[PDB]
Design a protein around this ligand. Structure first.
Ligand SMILES: CCNC(=O)[C@H](CC(C)C)NP(=O)(O)CNC(=O)OCc1ccccc1
Ligand SMILES: [Ca+2]
Ligand SMILES: [Ca+2]
Ligand SMILES: [Ca+2]
Ligand SMILES: [Ca+2]
Ligand SMILES: [Zn+2]
Length: 316
């Protein structure tokens, strides 16, 4: 909408206070004009018609329980935008400052979030498996990263390409979480997963097997559930990415860690310059090796570490 840029204040899903960029025209709307061609957050009002209504508020204060998922979707989309712009020189998900749209309060008791091809969508959870999912910065960045993938590599959402698609979202979700630097870890969704259980998460990148996800190619799922295991086999690539950054010895194979920033550079370059819609794990290895070669040189530690990490997870 046309209006003047304003700054509201509110509380997120976890009860933390934050400022948010809004737009005033009669109402204060969740429309952040400070980033690209805007970040827009919508109310789906417990239904499934999208996007719903652009979030309108009378006083620019967002402290109601109903406001919390909107506050976080809006704010964390901003953080994710900043990560891609500041770290990778990428302007929004399409590289041309496309407007970023999110809807919250999608459906009832909805234990998921997704990119629908045009926008991000967040359930409120059922209060047992999840609380409102936009409360997780890694979750928000995971969803926006699907848009980035779709505009770049275009990894088909099934089987190996789909598992790479998923891992890319977990990897950049985590790198965004570290970028914001509030309780960062290599776990996925811990802030909004199972409020009755402390210390767990939806997935782990550092040890995918803690939740039964594979950490080696020999343990890959080959069935048909979950689009051929896209949220399962992602563990193999998540583990490789974790090893590249942090190092470790895994099934007897030692990896020299090179840090998060270099992991991000290598995977961003792979995603945007080398991967294609049908890339498999072996092709991802080749893309990461080539990307590290471009950035750091063929004889570099970075290239050696990429090879070690894929060796460790059984991907040749
Ligand atoms: C429970 C499994 N879900 C996830 O892993 C994350 C949310 C996590 C990070 C909390 N959500 P996601 O991977 O974006 C869900 N994917 C998904 O719904 O894709 C199917 C689809 C495909 C095309 C259009 C719309 C939906
Ligand atoms: Ca208000
Ligand atoms: Ca965390
Ligand atoms: Ca996390
Ligand atoms: Ca939990
Ligand atoms: Zn995903």
């Amino acid at each position: 909408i046309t209006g003047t840029s304003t700054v509201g204040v509110g509380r997120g899903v976890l009860g933390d206070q934050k400022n948010i960029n809004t737009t005033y025209s009669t109402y204060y709307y969740l429309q952040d004009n400070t980033r690209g061609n805007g970040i827009f957050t919508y109310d789906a009002k417990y239904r499934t018609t999208l996007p719903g209504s652009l979030w309108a508020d009378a006083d620019n204060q967002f402290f109601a329980s109903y406001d919390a998922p909107a506050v976080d979707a809006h704010y964390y989309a901003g953080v994710t935008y900043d990560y891609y712009k500041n770290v990778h020189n990428r302007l929004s998900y399409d590289g041309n400052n496309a407007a970023i749209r999110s809807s919250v309060h999608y459906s009832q008791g909805y234990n998921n979030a997704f990119w629908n091809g045009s926008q991000m969508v967040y359930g409120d959870g059922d209060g047992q498996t999840f609380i409102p999912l936009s409360g997780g910065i890694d979750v928000v960045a995971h969803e926006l990263t699907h848009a980035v993938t779709d505009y770049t590599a275009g990894l088909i959402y099934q089987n190996e390409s789909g598992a790479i698609n998923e891992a890319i979202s977990d990897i950049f979700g985590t790198l965004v979480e570290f970028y914001a630097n509030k309780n960062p870890d290599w776990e996925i969704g811990e802030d909004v997963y199972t409020p009755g259980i402390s210390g767990d998460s939806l997935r782990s990148m550092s040890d995918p097997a803690k939740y039964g996800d594979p950490d080696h190619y020999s343990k890959r799922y080959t069935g048909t559930q979950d689009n051929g295991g896209v949220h399962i086999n992602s563990g193999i690539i998540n583990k490789a990415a974790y090893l590249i950054s942090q190092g470790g010895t895994h099934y007897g194979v030692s990896v020299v860690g090179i840090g998060r920033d270099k992991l991000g550079k290598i995977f961003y370059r792979a995603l945007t310059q080398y991967l294609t819609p049908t890339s498999n794990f072996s092709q991802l290895r080749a893309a990461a090796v080539q990307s590290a070669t471009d950035l750091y040189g063929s004889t570099s530690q970075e290239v050696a570490s990429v090879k070690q990490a894929f060796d460790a997870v059984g991907v040749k």
